[PDB]
Design a protein around this ligand. Structure first.
Ligand SMILES: CC[C@H](C)[C@H](NC(=O)[C@H](CC(C)C)NC(=O)[C@H](CCCN=C(N)N)NC(=O)c1nc(C)n(-c2ccc(Cl)cc2)n1)C(=O)N[C@@H](Cc1ccc(F)cc1)C(N)=O
Lengths: 258, 296
């Protein structure tokens, strides 16, 4: 394990900057909105629950969608096709057995055809120039977790939770690198469960001081307070499972000592 | 595609035929891996998605270079640097004479550097066997065929049923471990090392149980001292025969005291203690390494 940990961490920091979406892209989209995008991401959380997809697969699909909508305009009626191809590609790259194309066609409710989805798959590949090995919040969270003492797994779930939350809203979240979001999610979860705080280990590793996390943490802390209200409820319903120690039942802290 | 002249077929390795071809304009000889798009049932296969995305990040003199991807409606063409042949065929033809020791050390030294480069870029190969190892006439050897390779930014979950080769499979995977790690690459590589040395596959098993018992018979049956945890592994049984650790001198006769020492480190039972590719490059065995060229 720890012969490459740091090489890996360093290199994921380099890749994540290559794989960053254009941040003010939703404004250049004449027919789609941050809010439609929230509808699509939430639906992806459900498709992933249903087919027992890994969480990584969801973060990947979200990254592809955002790099795609970054250079290509899409009418509202095709947004979901872009989403479905994205989910298919993320599955092939990350999953052991990806659900077949029929299955993906099936879960849009035969709203596109198996050949439309495949032509979309090709076109996503072309636009992303086959760059699919994208660093996600889930990746950085996984690296971060090696530095927690002792391991708390209510801490882990709750962090994963917050990191999935941030996928829903391009509204603030496209401003932050995945390593920064993973940072605030880790701190926020550590904090909420135990009252402890973004550890020195990780300050020295990431060169991120608690202070630098403060802007992202504030938005994240807002997202976490307002979660029970948000138009989209999929990630909460997911994170109620015993598999996740019902962390999304837990009580957000109302202040942060920040 | 217009610029390429198919010269002859050189076959397959996971999905789609491989041709030697020359660029009619620049004159470069390349290897074209050509994939049929079932554009009505599956799409781009996941072997291709992985090998292309992963191999596009890896640029190193010991990893096969992906030159270009030519991306038409009905066909995907992968264009690689040409390499004269694989190590498997070479060992077949060097058989009865053996491969000279010094080329063995050069090959292993170069493989370790390619591996080290993968692993520091969160890429696992997962399917290292000699047919995947390509050599040229100038004495170079390269990791190839990344069809099964995986990014490990998050740990990689093991296929309950492995379509992933037998003879070169690590014992943690045979005992039903649930994650891969870079240690599986090191294990294959060590088997391939003994294979070059002794001239036959180290552990040529016939099922997963035969594989383990061939490993156990040479290295000795593990317990909790050698491998903390073994006895609580999904596929472990208290009923396994207890064999003894055979002397490595008997396993790999032609090898000196340092070779034997490295070899045995690449084949530690405990994935946590198995030597990494970085650390192996520092090994005293590599002190006199040169770059001989094969009789090819
Ligand atoms: C039926 C028309 C409404 C107005 C439309 N809804 C949709 O497009 C949604 C989008 C998805 C991502 C939720 N799609 C569907 O409901 C489509 C129906 C196609 C439209 N109906 C027609 N043409 N008769 N069906 C599904 O998505 C669907 N079917 C099933 C089953 N599931 C499903 C859900 C969960 C699981 Cl686990 C498995 C399957 N989803 C919609 O709300 N459009 C948005 C625009 C929009 C488009 C895509 C998008 F992702 C977000 C917004 C708007 N105009 O405000």
């Amino acid at each position: 394990v720890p012969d490459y940990h740091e090489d890996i961490h360093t290199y994921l920091r380099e890749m994540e900057v290559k794989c960053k979406p254009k941040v003010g892209y939703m404004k250049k989209q004449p027919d789609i909105t941050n809010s439609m995008r929230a509808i699509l991401v939430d639906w992806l959380v459900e498709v992933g629950e249903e087919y027992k997809l890994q969480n990584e697969t969801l973060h990947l699909a979200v990254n592809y969608i955002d790099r795609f909508l970054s250079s290509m305009s899409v009418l509202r009626g095709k947004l979901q096709l872009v989403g479905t191809a994205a989910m298919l590609l993320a599955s092939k790259f990350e999953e052991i057995y990806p659900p077949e194309v029929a299955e993906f066609v099936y879960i849009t409710d035969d709203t596109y055809t198996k050949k439309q989805v495949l032509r979309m798959e090709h076109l996503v590949l072309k636009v992303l120039t086959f760059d699919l090995a994208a660093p996600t919040v889930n990746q950085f969270l996984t690296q971060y977790f090696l530095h927690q003492q002792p391991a708390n797994c209510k801490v882990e779930s709750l962090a994963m939770f917050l990191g999935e939350l941030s996928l829903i809203d391009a509204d603030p979240y496209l401003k932050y690198l995945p390593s920064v979001i993973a940072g605030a999610a880790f701190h926020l979860a550590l904090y909420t469960v135990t009252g402890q705080s973004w550890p020195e280990s990780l300050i020295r590793k990431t060169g991120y001081t608690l202070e630098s996390l403060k802007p992202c943490l504030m938005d994240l802390h807002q997202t976490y307070l307002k979660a029970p209200q948000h138009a989209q409820q999929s990630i909460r319903e997911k994170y109620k499972n015993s598999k996740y120690h019902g962390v999304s039942l837990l009580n957000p802290p109302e202040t942060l000592n920040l | 595609m217009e610029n390429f002249q198919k010269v002859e077929k050189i076959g397959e390795g996971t999905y789609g035929v491989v041709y030697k071809a020359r660029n009619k304009l620049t004159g470069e000889v390349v290897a074209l891996k050509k994939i049929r798009l079932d554009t009505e049932t599956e799409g781009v296969p996941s072997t291709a998605i992985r090998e292309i995305s992963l191999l596009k990040e890896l640029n190193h003199p010991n990893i096969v270079k992906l030159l270009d991807v030519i991306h038409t409606e009905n066909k995907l063409y992968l264009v690689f640097e040409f390499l004269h042949q694989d190590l498997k065929k070479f060992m077949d033809a060097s058989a009865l004479t053996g491969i000279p020791l010094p080329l063995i050390k050069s090959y292993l030294f170069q493989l370790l550097q390619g591996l080290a480069f993968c692993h520091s870029h969160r890429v696992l190969h997962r399917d290292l066997k000699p047919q995947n190892l390509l050599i040229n006439t100038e004495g170079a050897i390269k990791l190839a065929d990344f069809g099964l390779a995986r990014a490990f930014g998050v740990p990689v979950r093991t296929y309950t049923h492995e379509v992933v080769t037998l003879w070169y499979r690590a014992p943690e995977i045979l005992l039903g471990c649930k994650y891969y790690s870079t240690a599986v690459d090191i294990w294959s590589l060590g088997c391939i090392f003994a294979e070059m040395v002794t001239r036959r596959a180290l552990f040529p098993g016939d099922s997963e149980i035969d594989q383990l018992f061939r490993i156990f018979r040479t290295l000795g049956t593990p317990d909790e001292v050698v491998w903390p945890g073994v006895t609580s592994m999904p596929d472990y049984k208290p009923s396994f025969p207890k064999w003894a650790r055979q002397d490595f001198s008997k396993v790999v006769p032609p090898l000196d005291e340092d070779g034997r020492s490295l070899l045995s480190q690449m084949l530690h039972y405990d994935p946590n203690k198995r030597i990494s590719a970085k650390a192996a490059l520092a090994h005293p065995f590599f002190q006199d390494v040169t770059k001989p060229v094969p009789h090819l």
